[PDB]
């Protein structure tokens, strides 16, 4: 599986999870977050060769089709599959408050 | 939203749904479906410039690439919402009818 467990220890040029750290203040201008100053969003990038990543039913059928039919349709690319929320802390006044932003962390990739 | 209704109306080169009918026996070698003989499966394709901001992550990356001098990923036009298809087969001499999940693509996203 194309997760941190595999992709961050091993050197790979095929479609994998790629590290990326985003400083809230300097990299987005999201001055309204007090904590944390940034976070590891990551992304998905690299090649999709033969049998590298399975996706849905639909990806399997497209690839079979593309082999059996003379006029192939579309070829797969590297995208996210499993996202994960991120809890941040901001202040109104001296008052703390917690919001859970959904789908902020890429935890795994796929070919589609 | 890049669904069947928007994208078919105007054939665009930017990311979109695209029509693709598929015959089971003729194009995948699936001789066991009694019926239907094919179906419009569709696919997703087209240019994605600097983002379909459905999910907050793709927004974050779209913005990061603007403000950071060293941008990260580029987007790509990929499936989004998938709906099943209802088949029919008889490998067992009696009529079966399941729903085959994730067989049609009804929308697309840049991601």
């Amino acid at each position, epitope marked *: 599986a194309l997760d941190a467990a595999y992709c961050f220890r091993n050197v790979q040029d095929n479609c994998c999870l*790629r590290p990326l750290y985003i400083d809230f203040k300097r990299d987005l201008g999201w001055k309204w977050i007090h904590e944390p100053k940034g976070y590891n969003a990551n992304f998905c990038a690299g090649a999709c060769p033969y049998l590298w990543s399975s996706d849905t039913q639909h990806s399997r059928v497209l690839s079979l089709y593309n082999t059996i039919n003379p006029e192939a349709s579309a070829s797969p690319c590297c995208v996210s599959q499993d996202l994960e929320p991120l809890t941040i802390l901001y202040y109104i006044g001296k008052t703390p408050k917690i919001e859970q932003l959904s789908n902020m962390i890429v935890k795994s990739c796929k070919c589609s | 939203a890049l669904d069947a209704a928007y994208c078919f109306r105007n054939v665009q080169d930017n990311c979109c749904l695209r029509p693709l009918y598929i015959d089971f026996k003729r194009d995948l070698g699936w001789k066991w479906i009694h019926e239907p003989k094919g179906y419009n499966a569709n696919f997703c394709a087209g240019a994605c410039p600097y983002w379909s901001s459905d999910t907050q992550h793709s927004r974050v990356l779209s913005l990061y690439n603007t403000i950071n001098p060293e941008a990260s990923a580029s987007p790509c036009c990929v499936s989004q919402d998938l709906e099943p298809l209802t088949i029919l087969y008889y490998i067992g001499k009696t009529p079966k009818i399941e729903q085959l999940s994730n067989m049609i693509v009804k929308s697309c996203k840049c991601s």
Partner: antibody
Amino acid sequence: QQLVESGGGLVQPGGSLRLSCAVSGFSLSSYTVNWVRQAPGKGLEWIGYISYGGSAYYASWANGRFTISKDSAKNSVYLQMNSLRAEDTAVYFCARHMQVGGAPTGSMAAFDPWGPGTLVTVSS
Amino acid sequence: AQLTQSPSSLSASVGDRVTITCQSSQSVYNNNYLSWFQQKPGKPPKLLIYGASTLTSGVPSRFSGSGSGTDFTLTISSLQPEDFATYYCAGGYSGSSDKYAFGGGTKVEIKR
């Protein structure tokens, strides 16, 4: 860590050329690669880059004349220019970013290592 | 965004100390994405100073970067005969165009 440019020579006014940087000691999925050119006796000029994550950005004056691309199996990055005017006679270098991408700390506008340069002559 | 270098040309003696100033039309990202490069004729640019002030290891200490935001200077302390070269500054930016940009160069010629 090396970057060897190639693809260069003389080309007809208005034609097209594609150059290729051959990268050796590093992986293109950690390092951005940039293309900067300099006319004979003129200053350097950043034409653009292809990032560790696969994003290409260009100088504002490129105007879609240049496209930067990469292949990690081929270990190369490409600068494809079309519609060569006289202006674009120059030496072209590919320069790596100094630091890996996506790290909490960036490269600080620093390029390292550099390629030797390959001359490109636009003339009839 | 463009950035202007001064002076375009200058001559000084062995031992003397020289100042080159880069100046950015627009603020550079994080205020320290500005580097300085040595270019001998018929060579690629050598990297002297990254982050406006950090010195590349093995590049000699007689080079120093100071400045921030939009104004930066490089200072060569005890000019050497082998320090004749043209000297460029690069800077990083935000936006969807011109992420990086060089200066006009400064040819430094030694007095004899």
